[PDB]
């Protein structure tokens, strides 16, 4: 819990207020462009279910991963910025992303 983007956003978005979550990805794209991935390339999910979809293009993402020294209450994260294709599992009506399956 310090000033880098991952420590700040993991806290603000209520991911580390009561636990340290090991890894989390944030996507820096407009919400509707992230929602548009549910009608893009259909692929199988890691678990073999087939409601996963891969973005046609790469998207700006930040990976946040807990360092080896992190312990609740002071969660500590390494921040890695990258542009990657995201894979999301979709459900509902409207058919929207409900889980992040990976980045590729």
């Amino acid at each position: 819990s310090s000033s880098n983007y991952c420590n700040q956003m993991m806290k603000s978005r209520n991911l580390t207020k009561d636990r340290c979550k090991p890894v989390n990805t944030f996507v820096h794209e407009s919400l509707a462009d992230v929602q548009a991935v549910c009608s893009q390339k259909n692929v199988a999910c890691k678990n073999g279910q087939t409601n996963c979809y891969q973005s046609y293009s790469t998207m700006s993402i930040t990976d946040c991963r807990e360092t080896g020294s992190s312990k609740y209450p002071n969660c500590a994260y390494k921040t890695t910025q990258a542009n990657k294709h995201i894979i999301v599992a979709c459900e509902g009506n409207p058919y929207v992303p409900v889980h992040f399956d990976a980045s590729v």
């Binding site: 991911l15 944030f26 996507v27 509902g92 409900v98 992040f100």
Partner: peptide
């Protein structure tokens, strides 16, 4: 209370 779609946005989207 929070739907799964809402939870995905809170945890993963930073428009």
């Amino acid at each position: 209370k929070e739907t799964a779609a809402a939870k995905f946005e809170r945890q993963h989207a930073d428009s």
